[PDB]
From a paper:
Mammalian ATG8 proteins comprise two subfamilies, namely LC3s (LC3A, LC3B, and LC3C) and GABARAPs (GABARAP, GABARAP-L1, and GABARAP-L2). The canonical LIR motif is a small Θ0-X1-X2-Γ3 motif, where Θ represents an aromatic residue (W/F/Y) and Γ an aliphatic residue (L/V/I) (whose side chains bind to hydrophobic pocket 1 (HP1) and HP2 of the LIR docking site (LDS), respectively) and X represents any amino acid (aa). In this study, we examined the molecular determinants that regulate selective binding of the centriolar satellite (CS) marker protein PCM1 (pericentriolar material 1) and the ULK1 complex to GABARAPs.
In order to find out whether their C-terminal regions are contributing to GABARAP binding in a similar way as observed for PCM1, we determined the crystal structure of ATG13441–454 and ULK1354–366 LIR motifs bound to GABARAP at a resolution of 1.14 and 1.07 Å, respectively. However, residues C-terminal of the ATG13 core LIR motif were not included and ATG13 LIR structures in complex with GABARAP subfamily members have not been reported. The ATG13 and ULK1 LIR motifs interacted with GABARAP in a very similar way. In the N terminus, the main chain of the aspartate in position X−2 (D442ATG13 and D355ULK1) formed a hydrogen bond with K48GAB from HP1. Within the core LIR sequence (Θ0-X1-X2-Γ3) the interactions were completely identical: (1) the canonical LIR interactions previously described for PCM1 structure, (2) in position X1, a valine (V445ATG13, V358ULK1) was packed against the aromatic ring of Y49GAB, (3) in position X2, a methionine was engaged in a large surface of hydrophobic interactions with L50GAB/Y25GAB, (4) in position Γ3, the carbonyl of the hydrophobic residue formed two hydrogen bonds with the guanidinium group of R28GAB. In position X5, ATG13 has a phenylalanine residue, F449ATG13, which engaged in more limited hydrophobic interactions with L55GAB and P52GAB from HP2.
Author numbering: -14 to 117
The structure:
């Protein structure tokens, strides 16, 4: 009866390339993701990498186990400190090529955007457009 109301996404959404995915075979990632979801069900596994062409410090660690109820805004706050951003430095996240809502929880993002390996992938940048 009723129509499913589909939300619009830009044409380039889902075009996120990650070095992590190139360096770790899919089935190893997927096996790990399944296991870590069972081991820590109140956390979500997240890969965080610099966006292509970003001009910003690199993280020493890419793999994060994040409480599901942590907001995107709180994750910004933590990441800024890990790379010693200055007060005037910008930081943007992208999930599937789109800046996620600052008020979303990481668990909400995970539900909507996790990949088939059971990981959520977040790119970060000094720029507000992914890969610019």
């Amino acid at each position: 009866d009723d129509f499913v109301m589909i939300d619009f996404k830009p044409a380039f959404s889902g075009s996120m390339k990650f070095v992590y995915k190139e360096e770790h075979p899919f089935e190893k990632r997927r096996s790990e993701g399944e296991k870590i979801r069972k081991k820590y069900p109140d956390r979500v596994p997240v890969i965080v990498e610099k966006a292509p062409k970003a001009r910003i410090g690199d993280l020493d660690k890419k793999k994060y186990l994040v409480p599901s109820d942590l907001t995107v805004g709180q994750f910004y706050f933590l990441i800024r400190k890990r790379i010693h951003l200055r007060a005037e430095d910008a930081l943007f996240f992208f999930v599937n090529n789109v800046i996620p809502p600052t008020s979303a929880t990481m668990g909400q993002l995970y539900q909507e955007h996790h990949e088939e390996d059971f990981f959520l992938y977040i790119a970060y940048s000094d720029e507000s457009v992914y890969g610019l």
